[PDB]
Antibody
Framework: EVQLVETGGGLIQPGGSVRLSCAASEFTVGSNFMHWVRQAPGKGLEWVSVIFKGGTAYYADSVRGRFVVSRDDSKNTLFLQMNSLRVDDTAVYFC??????????????????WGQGTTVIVSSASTKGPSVFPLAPSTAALGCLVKDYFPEPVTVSWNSGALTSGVHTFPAVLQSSGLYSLSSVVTVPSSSLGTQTYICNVNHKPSNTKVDKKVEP | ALTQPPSASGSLGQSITISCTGTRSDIGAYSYVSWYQQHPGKAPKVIIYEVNKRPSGVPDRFSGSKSGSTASLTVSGLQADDESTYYCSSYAGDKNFVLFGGGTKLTVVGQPKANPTVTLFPPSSEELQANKATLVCLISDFYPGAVTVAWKADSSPVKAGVETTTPSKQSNNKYAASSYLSLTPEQWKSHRSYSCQVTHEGSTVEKTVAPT
């Protein structure tokens, strides 16, 4: 399937740097106008940069001189190198394909394939990875309690992304302490508590922590 | 700058038209206006490009236009799926730059009411062994997005230790929320049972767990 897969990012101190990667599948980044678009917490979309098929890069004023967009065609990957980071660079970063015009080396300025987004947090705050506990009953459900982490976000998958049906990940709660917790759940037939074992994959990039927890009711 | 209304509301099965006001330097000068639909937590999806062209696969019921320096998106046959935030963009016209509007959050009224599914988990043995205990009350598939959550210890109401989330929209376009009751392992094991009571549109559903 056509797709863009993003990696990199996390929590970086002001003035530091990070590199984001955007890996294409079933199309070539060099045949397209590849954009970076970002979205600050609670805010809208803001354009960051584009790289033309020939390698020429253009940048929004807010990032000019600090960010570098480039491609590694041998790896069919688009990069965003983000230097001299500022608190206001905090955002989710999307890469996106702009097919350009049919007969001309010009963008159409609309993007039809988008990466899933990767979060960059520019902060001097300390971090804490989650503790993950199994949820089992005692149609039904089993899940993982992802407890006491900071800052947001955490992403959750099941069986390394092979299981999507019946999966529901719930929004995080702000605890009395200011830490966060959330839960993710798989819905199953109550008869199917026939002891299938499930694995929840919890990613907390801010603390560079990944947790696989076995859930066996 | 591209200016969009912060919110709009259309009726199920009907239409809504959202505006995007730019300048003669961008929307007025070029036919490179795009429209994006974004569900919370998801990447945007393009639904119109070059003012009125439908990207591959996008159904007919999405259409776009512009008159002067204002572009407009129309969504006909409104469905529950269409609730989301819509962003317009335009080629800056002056330099290789994309301008974005601030977004319009679209509400679709007249949707069918849905009562929540409620799942209550007791503390895991692994958490108790860690000298902690959390009751987890999960609430899903309800519309519209507003619930009240109350907890009982045995039969008695309890406010201490309760943390309840705001409602958030799901992939099925229904809302979800969570409520967590923090108690000591002593509190958990010494009580006959704990209950989570979820109220939605006057309809209250109760679930109960017990240490035994």
């Amino acid at each position: 399937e056509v797709q863009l897969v993003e990696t990199g990012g996390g929590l970086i101190q002001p003035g530091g740097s990070v590199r984001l990667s955007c890996a294409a599948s079933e199309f070539t980044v060099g045949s397209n106008f590849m954009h970076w678009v970002r979205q600050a917490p609670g805010k809208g979309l803001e354009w960051v940069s584009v790289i033309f098929k020939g390698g020429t890069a253009y940048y929004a004023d807010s990032v000019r001189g600090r960010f570098v967009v480039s491609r590694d065609d041998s790896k069919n990957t688009l990069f965003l190198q983000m230097n001299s980071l500022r608190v206001d660079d905090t955002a989710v970063y999307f890469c996106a394909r702009d097919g350009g015009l049919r007969f001309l080396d010009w963008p159409r300025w609309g993007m039809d394939v988008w990466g899933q987004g990767t979060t960059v947090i520019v902060s001097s705050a300390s971090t804490k990875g989650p503790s993950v506990f199994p949820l089992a009953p005692s149609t039904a459900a089993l899940g993982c309690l992802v407890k006491d982490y900071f800052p947001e976000p955490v992403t959750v998958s099941w069986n390394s992304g092979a299981l999507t049906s019946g999966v529901h990940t719930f929004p995080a709660v702000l605890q009395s302490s200011g830490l966060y917790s959330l839960s993710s759940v798989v819905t199953v037939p109550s008869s199917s508590l026939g002891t299938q074992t499930y694995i929840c994959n919890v990613n907390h990039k801010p603390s560079n922590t990944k947790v696989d927890k076995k859930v066996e009711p | 700058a591209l200016t969009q209304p912060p919110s709009a509301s259309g009726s199920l099965g009907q239409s809504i038209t959202i505006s995007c006001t730019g300048t003669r330097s961008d929307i007025g000068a070029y036919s490179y206006v795009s429209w994006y639909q974004q569900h919370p937590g998801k990447a945007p999806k393009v639904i119109i490009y070059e003012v009125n062209k439908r990207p591959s696969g996008v159904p007919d019921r999405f259409s776009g236009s512009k008159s002067g320096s204002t572009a407009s998106l129309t969504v006909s046959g409104l469905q529950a799926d269409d609730e989301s935030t819509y962003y317009c963009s335009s080629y800056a016209g002056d330099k290789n730059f994309v301008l974005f509007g601030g977004g319009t959050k679209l509400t679709v009224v007249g949707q069918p009411k849905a009562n929540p599914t409620v799942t209550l988990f007791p503390p895991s043995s692994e958490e108790l062994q860690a000298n902690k205990a959390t009751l987890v009350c999960l609430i899903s598939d309800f519309y519209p997005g507003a619930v009240t959550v109350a907890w009982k210890a045995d039969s008695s109401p309890v406010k201490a230790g309760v943390e309840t989330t705001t409602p958030s929209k799901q992939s099925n376009n229904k809302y979800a929320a969570s409520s967590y009751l923090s108690l000591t392992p002593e509190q958990w094991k010494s009580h006959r049972s704990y209950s989570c009571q979820v109220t939605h549109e006057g309809s209250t559903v109760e679930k109960t767990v017990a240490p035994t």
